[PDB]
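Retro notes
What went well: the complex prediction finally ran end to end.
Inputs used:
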Amino acid sequence: KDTPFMVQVKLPNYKDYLLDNKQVVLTFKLVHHSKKITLIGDANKILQYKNYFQANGARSDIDFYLQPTLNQKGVVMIASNY
Amino acid sequence: KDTPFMVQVKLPNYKDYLLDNKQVVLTFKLVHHSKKITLIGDANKILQYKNYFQANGARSDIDFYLQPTLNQKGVVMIASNY
């Protein structure tokens, strides 16, 4: 069956991210295949990302873990199928 | 411009991996996008994988890192574009 994976990607400010079409498509393929998503960064930034994926169809059986940080630039997303 | 990534996948023994076409194709998609590949597992097994990726990966700019362990169940592969 599917190869167990963990993918960590470095994402920009939510605003700039929406302007990077290739990055947006990549993150949605990641979410599509994941059962666990962790977002690390400023609390408001990671909420933007969480809500955006959920607003666009992310299943309720995907577990989102928010790790707020202080004075950290950007967002880190970790996606896993286990 | 490309999203910085690090992908960690769990692979079976080399001889079983060769029979999983979907897993073979996935690992070469990883190789094709990576600048660094780390293989963690039994010294003989991670060498088989390294040689396979070097011979058939069609990339000349990848740095391969070997981490021998005493684990006998498969190997862990970490692929990154930084």
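What we learned: The two ends of chain A are 13 Å apart (CA to CA).
What to try next: split runs per interface for comparison.
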